[PDB]
Amino acid sequence: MKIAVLGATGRAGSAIVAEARRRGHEVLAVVRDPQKAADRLGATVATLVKEPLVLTEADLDSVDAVVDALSVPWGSGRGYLHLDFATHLVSLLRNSDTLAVFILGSASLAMPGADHPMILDFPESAASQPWYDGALYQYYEYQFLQMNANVNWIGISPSEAFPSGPATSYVAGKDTLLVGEDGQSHITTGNMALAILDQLEHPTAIRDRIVVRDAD
Amino acid sequence: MKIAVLGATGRAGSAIVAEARRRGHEVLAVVRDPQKAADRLGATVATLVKEPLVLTEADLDSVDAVVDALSVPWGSGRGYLHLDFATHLVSLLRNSDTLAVFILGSASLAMPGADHPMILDFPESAASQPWYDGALYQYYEYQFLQMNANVNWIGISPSEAFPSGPATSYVAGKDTLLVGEDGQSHITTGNMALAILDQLEHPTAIRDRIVVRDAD
Ligand SMILES: NC(=O)C1=CN([C@@H]2O[C@H](COP(=O)(O)OP(=O)(O)OC[C@H]3O[C@@H](n4cnc5c(N)ncnc54)[C@H](OP(=O)(O)O)[C@@H]3O)[C@@H](O)[C@H]2O)C=CC1
Ligand SMILES: NC(=O)C1=CN([C@@H]2O[C@H](COP(=O)(O)OP(=O)(O)OC[C@H]3O[C@@H](n4cnc5c(N)ncnc54)[C@H](OP(=O)(O)O)[C@@H]3O)[C@@H](O)[C@H]2O)C=CC1
């Protein structure tokens, strides 16, 4: 199948591009940095150099799936982009069969033993932390997705830690932070890539959100 | 000031353009039908012939305010456009002073006396009505707007009925359906235009939603 990867030059994105190619899919890497694309993805990966917010329906009409691996640096003040990229992507998928996987945040997950997103219980002081702006808008991105019953979107949240690393295996859940045998909560970029491509090839979480951690 | 009107050729839109011109503002009417613009707005009103979803930041950077007067016909299945047009517009207003007024729906208002949006209480049968699709997505549009604490958006809901007619005066509320001395709930296209231009000239409802009905 043909897969457009938004944020293809990123940590999650580049891992997704590699896993996609391993699995025999045609990749279109949407990028702003051709050099980064040449170095991280390889000369052989097809490229569309365009601002994500300016992508059109035509840009996406040859593709069977889209993966949103875009992010926003902490302390930029531009956490709203998490939301804007997603709303824009959804707007291009109206009346289309196209699968769209969105990587979400950990803050929209429940703590173990809770029944609601942990961000709701954050202290007022949290808004002063550089990570909050992005966490808030990814929580909103998650809520926005649920407004769309007629688009083939899939949400996947990382565990608390999202380090770079090769794939091994992953364990999946629904809305609650997962903790492994080591008492920690982490997923590698490689294992997130496995989970994403797994859903693309066999969608089980359409219009739902899952969370993934590294297996033990 | 310079005001861009989306849905300028519509019932609400054309009334808004008129009131804007009466009040000495420069109007940019975003339209898809030039002949309709010529007939309803006048040879004298500047036009931008473009799909709202492809409007750019540059299109809007001379404007001081934008008014969303777009709608979707009943039974089209395209009620999602209420949301898509609003999410696109918001994306263009990031880090700008520009005032954006969004005409919302009555379904996100409480019935007189209730403490919650009336749509939450609709029976299951409601979803079979041709008005529901649009109503649902305008409730979502209202919710989406509240995700955006750093944009100068203003929400205005009509009363239950939104007939064409000239301005007289209006009465404003917050989140509850308003009923006049006739026992009815209605606002004319002309009175909505008064309310919108009032907010543009003296914003009192920034990042808030008001409701308006025709005065007695
Ligand atoms: N524990 C958790 O919940 C956390 C969740 N995550 C999430 O995972 C996802 C992927 O994260 P990650 O792989 O580390 O991110 P990266 O920081 O590696 O960069 C992601 C992509 O975003 C692109 N990009 C960033 N800003 C813009 C913009 N303004 N215009 C255009 N493109 C842009 C970058 O382009 P370029 O390469 O050219 O710079 C890059 O390709 C995100 O949703 C992030 O929030 C990440 C960390 C942990
Ligand atoms: N009780 C309530 O909640 C109700 C709420 N309303 C709301 O009032 C607002 C204005 O409604 P109203 O003035 O009567 O609407 P109209 O139906 O008169 O006009 C709709 C405007 O949208 C434009 N438009 C429609 N479809 C598209 C499209 N697919 N692409 C581009 N432009 C498009 C039309 O262009 P064109 O002229 O070329 O067709 C027109 O300018 C809306 O938000 C509507 O939901 C209205 C009635 C009551």
CA gap B34, A197 in Å, rounded = 47
Range(s) of the domain holding residue A175: 2-216
CA of B55: which chain A residue's CA is closest? Answer: A54
Q: How many helices (H) and strands (E) does chain A have?
A: 6, 8
Mutate to test the interface with B, among A88, A147, A148 (most CBs of B within 10 A): A147
Ligand 2 interacting residues, C-beta cut-off 6 A: B 7, 9-13, 32-33, 36, 52, 69-72, 81, 103, 105-107, 134, 138, 158, 160, 162
**Which of B69, B33, B85, B82 shows the shortest CA–CA distance to B192?**
B69
C-alpha to C-alpha distance for A16 and B148, rounded to whole angstroms: 30
* B contact set with A (CB within 8 A): 53-54, 56, 78, 80, 83-84, 87-88, 90-91, 94, 137, 140, 143-144, 147-148, 150
Look at chain A and count its residues: 216
- What's the length of chain B? 216
Of A88, A94, A147, the CB nearest to B91: A88
Inter-chain touch B148–A80, beta carbons under 8 Å: yes
| Helix or strand run (H / E) with residue A100 | strand A99-103
Q: Are B180 and B112 in contact (CB under 8 A)?
A: no
Cα(A71) to ligand 1 centroid in Å equals 3
Q: What is the DSSP letter of A181?
A: T
Please list, in sequence order, all residues whose beta carbon lies within 8 angstroms of the beta carbon of residue B170, skipping any fewer than 6 positions away.
Answer: B187, B191, B192, B194, B195, B212, B213, B214, B215
* Domains: count for chain A: 1
- Smallest CA–CA distance, residue A95 to chain B, in Å, is 9
**How many angstroms separate the CA atoms of A75 and A6, rounded?**
22
Cα–Cα distance for residue pair A73/A56, rounded to 1 Å: 25
- Give the DSSP H or E segment for B82: helix B80-92
Q: Report the DSSP beta bridge partners of residue B65.
A: B3, B99
Beta bridge partners, A170, equal A214
- Resolution at which this structure was determined, Å: 1.8
Q: Is B2 helix (H, G, I), strand (E, B) or coil?
A: strand
Which of B169-173's residues contact partners 24+ apart within 8 Å by CB, and which partners?
A: B169/B194, B169/B214, B169/B215, B170/B194, B170/B195, B170/B212, B170/B213, B170/B214, B170/B215, B171/B212, B171/B213, B171/B214, B171/B215, B171/B216, B172/B210, B172/B211, B172/B212, B173/B210, B173/B211, B173/B212, B173/B213
Instruction: Rounding to the nearest 10 degrees, give the CA dihedral for residues B21, B24, B26, B31.
Output: -10
Distance CA B110, CA A113 (A): 34
CATH of residue B155's domain is 3.40.50.720
- Contact status, residue A90 vs residue A145, Cβ threshold 8 Å: yes
Look up tokens 């490689």; give the residue: A190
Contact A206, A154 (CB under 8 A): yes
CA distances from B108 to A8, A20, B101, B120 (A): 39, 43, 16, 9
Q: Assign residue A202 a region: left if phi > 0, alpha if psi is -120 to 50, beta otherwise?
A: beta
Alpha carbon distance B145, B14 (integer Å): 24
Task: List helix spans (H) across A65-182.
Answer: 80-92, 132-145
Q: How far apart are CA A203 and CA A90, in angstroms?
A: 18
Residues B77-99: b if buried by 16+ CB within 10 A, e if exposed: eebbbbbbbbbbbbbbbbeeebb
* Sequence ranges of the binding site of B: 9-12, 32, 36, 70-71, 82, 103, 106, 138, 159-160
Side by side, the strands of the sheet bearing B26-31 are: B46-49, B26-31, B2-6, B65-68, B99-103, B153-158, B209-214, B170-173
From B90, which residue of chain A is nearest by alpha-carbon distance? Answer: A84
Whether A143 sits inside 8 A of B147 (CB atoms) is yes
Neighbours of A61 (CB within 10 A): 10
Binding positions of A for NADPH: 9-12, 32, 36, 70-71, 82, 103, 106, 138, 159-160
Distance of CA B131 to the CA centre of its chain: 17
**Type of residue at B8:** A
Number of alpha carbons in the 13 Å side-chain half-sphere of residue A16: 32
Structure determined by: X-ray
Rounded distance between C-alpha atoms, residue B157 and residue B162, angstroms: 10
Contact predicate A108/A142, CB 8 Å: yes
Contact A80 B144 (CB under 8 A): no
In chain A, residues with a C-beta closer than 8 Å to the C-beta of B148 are: 80
Q: Could you tell me which residues come within 8 angstroms of residue B59 by beta carbon, excluding any fewer than 6 positions away?
A: B4, B48, B50
Q: Do the chains contact at A91 and B88, CB–CB below 8 Å?
A: yes
According to DSSP, the residues that pair with A101 across neighbouring strands are A67, A154
How many angstroms does the Cα of residue A19 sit away from the middle of ligand 2? Answer: 45
Q: How far is residue B62's CA from residue B56's CA, in Å, rounded to a whole number?
A: 12
The DSSP line for B141-192 is: HHHHHTT-TTS-EEEEEE-SB--------EEEESSB----TTS--B--HHHH
